[PDB]
Amino acid sequence: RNNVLTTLQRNIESTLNSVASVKDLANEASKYEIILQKGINQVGLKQYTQVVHKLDDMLEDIQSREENSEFHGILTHLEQLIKRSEAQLRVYFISILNSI
């Protein structure tokens, strides 16, 4: 049953956005420039990191798409919010890992 999650709901939950559209990812990715620019501790553990799986997994099948202008602009907005998030992550890592 953990395999039923881990096989069926795993790649089912992955291929939710097997086809998914172009503008909506800019909309809710911009809403993850809302929520990803709320910090970590406001947002929370799998909240923050799973939203990183939502832009990670919103940059996801776009390598599978085609080249319009919104393709490149969403590559910029996505990947720069990605590395803002990653920098904030390692900041928080080091922030507690010499809190001693």
Partner: protein, 33 residues
């Protein structure tokens, strides 16, 4: 046919996720809603 499509095609992603945009990719975005 969400049993056939949802259950039988992309639940384990066999076959791949882009063919649903390709083998079912001709002006059927209503059916994708």
């Amino acid at each position: 046919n969400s049993t056939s499509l949802r259950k039988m095609l992309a639940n384990p992603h066999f076959n791949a996720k882009d063919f649903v945009h390709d083998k079912l990719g001709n002006a059927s975005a209503i059916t994708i809603d």
